[PDB]
Point group: D3
Chain length 227, copies 6
Amino acid sequence: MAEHCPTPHNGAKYGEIAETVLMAGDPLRVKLLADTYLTDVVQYNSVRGAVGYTGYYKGVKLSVQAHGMGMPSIGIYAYELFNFYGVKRIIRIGSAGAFDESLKLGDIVIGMGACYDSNFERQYDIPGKYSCIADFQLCREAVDAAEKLGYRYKVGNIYSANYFYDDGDHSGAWKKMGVLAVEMEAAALYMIAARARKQALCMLTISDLCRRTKFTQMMEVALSLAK
Amino acid sequence: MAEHCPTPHNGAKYGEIAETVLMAGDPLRVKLLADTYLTDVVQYNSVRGAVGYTGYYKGVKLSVQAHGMGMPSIGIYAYELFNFYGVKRIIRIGSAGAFDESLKLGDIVIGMGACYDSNFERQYDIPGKYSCIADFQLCREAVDAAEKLGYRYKVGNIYSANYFYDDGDHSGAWKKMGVLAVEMEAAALYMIAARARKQALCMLTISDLCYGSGEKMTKFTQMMEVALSLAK
Amino acid sequence: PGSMAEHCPTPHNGAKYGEIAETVLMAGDPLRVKLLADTYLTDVVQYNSVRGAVGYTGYYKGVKLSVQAHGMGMPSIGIYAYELFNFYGVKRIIRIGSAGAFDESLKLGDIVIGMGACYDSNFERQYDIPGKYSCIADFQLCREAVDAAEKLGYRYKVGNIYSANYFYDDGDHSGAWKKMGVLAVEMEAAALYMIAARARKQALCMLTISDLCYGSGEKMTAEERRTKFTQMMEVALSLAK
Amino acid sequence: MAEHCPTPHNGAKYGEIAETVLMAGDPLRVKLLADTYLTDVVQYNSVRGAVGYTGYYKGVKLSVQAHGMGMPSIGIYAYELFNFYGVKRIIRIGSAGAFDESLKLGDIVIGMGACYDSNFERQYDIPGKYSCIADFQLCREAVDAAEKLGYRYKVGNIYSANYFYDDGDHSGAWKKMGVLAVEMEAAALYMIAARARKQALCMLTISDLCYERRTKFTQMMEVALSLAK
Amino acid sequence: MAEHCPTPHNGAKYGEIAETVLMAGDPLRVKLLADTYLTDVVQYNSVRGAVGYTGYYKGVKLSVQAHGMGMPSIGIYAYELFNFYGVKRIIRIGSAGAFDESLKLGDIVIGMGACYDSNFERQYDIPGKYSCIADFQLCREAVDAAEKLGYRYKVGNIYSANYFYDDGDHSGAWKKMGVLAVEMEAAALYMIAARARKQALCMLTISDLCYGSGEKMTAEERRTKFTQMMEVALSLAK
Amino acid sequence: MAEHCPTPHNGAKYGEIAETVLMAGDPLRVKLLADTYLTDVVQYNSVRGAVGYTGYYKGVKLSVQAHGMGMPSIGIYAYELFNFYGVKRIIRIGSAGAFDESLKLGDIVIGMGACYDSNFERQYDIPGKYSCIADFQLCREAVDAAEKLGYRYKVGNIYSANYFYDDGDHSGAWKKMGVLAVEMEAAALYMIAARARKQALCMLTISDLCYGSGEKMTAEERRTKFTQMMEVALSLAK
Ligand SMILES: Nc1ncnc2c1ncn2[C@@H]1O[C@H](CO)[C@@H](O)[C@H]1O
Ligand SMILES: Nc1ncnc2c1ncn2[C@@H]1O[C@H](CO)[C@@H](O)[C@H]1O
Ligand SMILES: Nc1ncnc2c1ncn2[C@@H]1O[C@H](CO)[C@@H](O)[C@H]1O
Ligand SMILES: Nc1ncnc2c1ncn2[C@@H]1O[C@H](CO)[C@@H](O)[C@H]1O
Ligand SMILES: Nc1ncnc2c1ncn2[C@@H]1O[C@H](CO)[C@@H](O)[C@H]1O
Ligand SMILES: Nc1ncnc2c1ncn2[C@@H]1O[C@H](CO)[C@@H](O)[C@H]1O
């Protein structure tokens, strides 16, 4: 929908963002990704400091975009990318707290599914519980890539919380259910992708137990998904 | 584990059920699968007519077991299989109604995730919404096997309903969300397997259309062949 | 209303329209259903073997009735009961089953008449009910069942039962039901009651206590199961019309 | 527990209230009941105008008491009566709106079950849906009494609403489910009676259709009075 | 809407109720307020014993009306008043238990917001959580009057419970959230006022402490110590 | 708690943030606020580009900080500020869409309460419905400032949504309940402040009318027509 670009949150015109977007929470990290991996970089967004860049990675056009923190924030960005900019694929990368005791610091978690605190699923009027899943194909390509590069990974359920600071201790039930790791965004992305018939995947590096070399390895898995 | 066998629902003693169980709702279908694909068949269960057989498929030990209809029913059998009988993987095959308009009668759906009506999940005291997912490895192998056999398949989200007959029309929101198909069991299986740290996957054949003409079937062997290729 | 010949046979029932009588007794276990038909019915015809959910139609003291397996859990009984009331013209369904005792005055073999059924989620959402729906039995069946147990001199209680969606619980979610005076736990009644209410038809669940959910947790042997469900079946059979 | 009587809502000392209580929402109707049917009447409560009287009906000691409107109101009174005053049976009588289209003004509805909006349940920590039911024996006796007098009645499900005025129209699903009539109190009474192991029943006269007034209420009162032991 | 008066719960004809209504739960207390503070008193209601009177307070027509106990009861009366009788302003007065440990017996609590157990928000078809609030202007005038007269008060969140008798102990989480006091009515009044675009406020005198040793007002203090709250409420008469 | 600063979201050490913090979603707006109104400005945070500055307004030390978009984002910042940095009051300022049809572009809305979609009430284990309210004293001060300066304002309920794009139309019931305006942050701030026993207020400038013909502020108006709100907000610094 070219008529809806630029948006209140994104200064890009239609066509300035690639069909594959890598997203991360921190704009400083998004900039480091652009500087490290992309050639011919142009910035298409600086609205609200949520920097977005478009460049080339091994000859294919690729965009990297900041999404801020929490499901409502990434929801706004992903909705616009999928529905207004013609984006096909969003891969979110970031750090996470491990719930699963067998995960080591720097292990890659591939988020096949995302559990969640209520966000904006109510706005879809779903008469039961909706299970947020990644796109099977991105998930399969991310696993094949980790296996090809011989990196340590686990694929399974993550948890997209609305809180960073817990007023209680609410982690026990998720741990008992086999959830691998906690972050704050994936479930919103998966829902929006599913509604749009587009592909999303969240990949995470474990950084806390509930770095540059480890994180770089997560990047090589993610970047291998660029199309 | 062994001390809990036999159970109120399963006459098998510990060890009489293989590490891989293939499950279907209908005991007549389970019997067929046993008669068609397994050799040296022993029936380990007849409790409540929920038949269970152990035999060899291509010389590899395998069990096949009826689970009845609905999440509470499959919950009982899968909880017992995973927690008392030492079962490592359950592959469920079944029929489903299509929500996605590109699915035709006889297409196969691989349930990567399962949406659900509230069942027994309250028992887990979960402070949010739990997303039910299949075992990824099973998922991938099922896709590869379907591809190699040349079957029409889709992999994605399915919906485990508590009803076969809808008092209204509640399929709309699920359809908007991209959910592929409706059955009555998968979410319970997936939850129980995740808690047990075991593997589960649900595969389905579209037997009725929940859109358009609503055409229904009066042709399940292709799905059995994908399922059988997962046995270990 | 209640009769739709063109929807018979269904995906779950091989019966043609008219092969099922106006009163159906239902139990979870197809072996109990067969036993009941073998013990009590004459002129018996099997009208269903679909999914092993055996169903028979026969006569008891000159009255035609059907007996049918319904499998385990609310979604399962919900399928069969919906079809029976909406497609097969059934007027009355009496569920007979086994149950775990919550009320400590109940002994093994005691009969519980489910005037009401508490429940974990079943069909309520699909009916779009904007509050809490209380699942109750048909008063007339309830009253007949109590009168029969009373005339036959059986130990019974009439009150609330609980239709659970689980058999296993890693913890203990039973305390609050006991406090509320719930008598017994099973897994089906509430869905039956809701489906019958929707259809304006009659339903009742009766139970025999086969396990105690208190104390040392005594349970019936297989022999006691075979022989101590007689009293309930007989009460149930006298409700057929 | 005599130690808890009188209460903040009830001036009665332990023993001033009989083992059977008839309850209605309206204190004026409660006074009329005592004046009409009871002999040797003593008023045991006037706190908040929620009048309570004790007297004899055909030689049997009986109490009648106002409960006001809504589940939180009846819950306070019923809780005190069952847990503090040694009350064994409460029969509530009142008016209701019809949901079932075959009900005429003045029909009697016997509430075997009561559907509800939230009132009391959450405070009991119940991990599922609690079905609120009447005492079977009382329900049976009411049905026999109505049948014997040959009154038009139905016995089945009622709905205890938290509202008299509906902002939209939320009656449709209740009607589809066969719920007979709407009032505002029964389910709380039923829940509190079940928790206490005591007996309760709600009976109603249809006064409005949600789809001679005094004389209509009298038939119900006569059925109610039949149940007093 | 004159055509809806009298109602099943209120014998008044349209115009017999003033634009400002003071409400309390207890009819005995409503009668006392009328006799004490109003001149030219006419009783407009005695239906269900929920007495209502109209008179003058310092030259301004004012009505006082009983509302019974609980959100459904006050909901009926408030709905009628705002939607049929042309009422602009309802101030509820009453007693409450303290959750906040710095409140003493006799302190005034002004309910800027009301937490609640579900009573009848479902009937409004709200697709999230609705926060029940008082009218700011009334709230501001109550706080000013309390300060000007030097009364001990706190202004903040109250809790409208569905129960007087707790089967368990559910007070902990409210206390953690800073909720000041528990009563049984305010949230429904506030929701109905907001829907009608009218003004409502609940003020409370602490009559029991729901913390520590559970101190209660004596029967004598209950009879006596609601006068301060009255002068605050009466400041709001318009 | 000096030991918990800096945090993973904030590079400030304890004491680098004043006891009053004005927060807005957009770091470019926060920067503009610091440059236009504050003297002796020091930047204490650039973590995640969520800039924060501390400086002086009319002799009074204050901070201004970006909070990003949505309740979980503001929840992170506000939790840290109240619990680690010793902050006493946080005033959120922002733009909002009007639900109330008497509101014009540029009207100021003071959020006495905030309705909400789920944020982290679940995390507080509350056994009913919690009404999110502002601090009464900030609320009174804001209204007083707006009156003395003569600005057009309304005080009442706002709605903190979890969505900006509505997959349908869920606005009807909020409008019906008399909610004034929609934004995405206030309820979480209010809840956290209540738990912490600290003060919070959200004030909004109407930038879009979610009714009628749908008038929206010009890009020039969005850039420049927020000064009236900012002046009210600044007068709350102590
Ligand atoms: N333990 C954790 N809990 C919640 N979010 C986390 C955690 N660790 C990393 N994150 C991620 O970092 C950001 C919050 O610091 C969020 O946007 C989230 O994706
Ligand atoms: N449209 C449908 N809705 C629900 N379950 C279905 C449907 N079609 C097939 N099934 C499957 O068939 C069985 C019931 O006929 C169930 O156990 C369920 O798994
Ligand atoms: N203690 C119990 N808990 C749950 N279901 C029971 C129990 N006892 C008997 N049942 C009945 O038996 C089956 C499960 O064993 C169910 O269909 C249920 O109706
Ligand atoms: N249509 C109705 N809706 C709710 N309550 C009703 C209705 N008709 C009569 N009542 C009864 O009368 C009182 C409301 O006037 C309530 O106490 C309730 O028990
Ligand atoms: N602790 C309390 N809990 C509930 N209601 C109370 C409490 N203290 C006083 N009240 C008030 O007293 C009445 C019940 O006696 C209610 O209408 C309510 O407004
Ligand atoms: N109509 C609106 N809906 C949601 N958020 C809005 C609206 N207008 C302004 N906002 C604010 O602006 C941001 C969305 O761009 C949110 O952070 C929110 O606070």
